Amino acid sequence: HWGYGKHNGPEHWHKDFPIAKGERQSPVDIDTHTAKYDPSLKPLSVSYDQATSLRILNNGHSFQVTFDDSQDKAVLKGGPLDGTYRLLQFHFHWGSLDGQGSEHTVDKKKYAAELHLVHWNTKYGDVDKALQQPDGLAVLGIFLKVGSAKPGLQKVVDVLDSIKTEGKSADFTNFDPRGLLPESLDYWTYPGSLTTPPLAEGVTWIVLKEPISVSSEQVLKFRKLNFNGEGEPEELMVDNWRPAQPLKNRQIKASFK
Ligand SMILES: NS(=O)(=O)NCCNc1nonc1/C(=N/O)Nc1ccc(F)c(Br)c1
Numbered sequence: 001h002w003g004y005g006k007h008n009g010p011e012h013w014h015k016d017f018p019i020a021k022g023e024r025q026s027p028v029d030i031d032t033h034t035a036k037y038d039p040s041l042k043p044l045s046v047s048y049d050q051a052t053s054l055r056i057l058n059n060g061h062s063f064q065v066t067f068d069d070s071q072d073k074a075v076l077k078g079g080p081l082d083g084t085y086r087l088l089q090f091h092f093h094w095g096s097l098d099g100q101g102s103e104h105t106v107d108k109k110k111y112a113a114e115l116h117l118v119h120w121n122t123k124y125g126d127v128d129k130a131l132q133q134p135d136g137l138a139v140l141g142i143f144l145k146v147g148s149a150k151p152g153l154q155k156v157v158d159v160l161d162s163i164k165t166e167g168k169s170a171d172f173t174n175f176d177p178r179g180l181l182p183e184s185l186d187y188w189t190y191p192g193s194l195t196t197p198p199l200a201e202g203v204t205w206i207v208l209k210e211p212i213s214v215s216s217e218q219v220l221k222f223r224k225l226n227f228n229g230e231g232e233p234e235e236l237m238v239d240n241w242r243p244a245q246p247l248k249n250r251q252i253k254a255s256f257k
């Protein structure tokens with residue numbers, strides 16, 4: 001029922017999900033001049049060498065690549081995090097034009113797209129329990145700008161023609177998510193929420209400072225996806241982003257000066 005259109009988009013979500021107007025909603029604008037460098041923050045540990053990707057799915061909102069999270073194979077540790085967070089899936093948000101598509105903004109700047117790598121805290125045993133905890137989830141957010149092609153994204157782009165419509169899935173084994181990371185792990189962090197229903201307020205956000213570059217041809221292939229199911233009127237999957245939400249009583253911390 002929820003989506004990104006005039007009649008079902010972000011301004012409507014609070015009716016089914018009242019936490020949409022909560023105290024720790026995401027995304028937010030990252031004001032680089034009010035974010036506090038926190039020298040007590042540790043380096044982030046991204047340990048993706050043993051990652052086991054499974055499937056790629058058009059879920060009617062985005063496309064997602066799912067991972068085996070039955071063991072510590074692809075984990076995030078350190079930075080602002082206590083303990084070990086397992087990678088469950090990644091997905092993207094993107095625009096109809098190159099000047100919009102990101103959910104987070106940086107000094108009000110919107111990027112062409114944003115990659116979200118979703119992780120859950122292993123002390124809660126499964127993602128369904130983790131979703132109910134204020135420290136249950138950690139999302140690593142990476143901005144996309146249009147420039148040079150990202151070679152590590154091409155295997156994703158090339159399969160999207162096989163998952164054009166809602167509910168379509170395909171095998172997507174042996175994908176290495178290390179190929180989606182920028183050089184630097186410098187980040188901003190703040191407590192927030194999922195940016196899609198159910199908008200659960202259990203996410204530690206880690207947003208990397210350095211965007212990755214993707215080619216115009218790569219992002220054009222995202223924009224050929226459909227929100228609709230096979231047989232329904234064709235509605236291009238574009239502008240599947242939630243805008244910035246009130247910061248309220250929150251501090252954004254930076255890992256870098
Ligand atoms: N745009 S965002 O903030 O990164 N949204 C991510 C939303 N997806 C998920 N968050 O955390 N588990 C997620 C996910 N991926 O397949 N499955 C999932 C599993 C169980 C549940 F009860 C719910 Br609700 C979602």
Ligand SMILES: [Zn+2]
Pocket residue numbers: 091092093116195
């Ligand atoms: Zn997301």
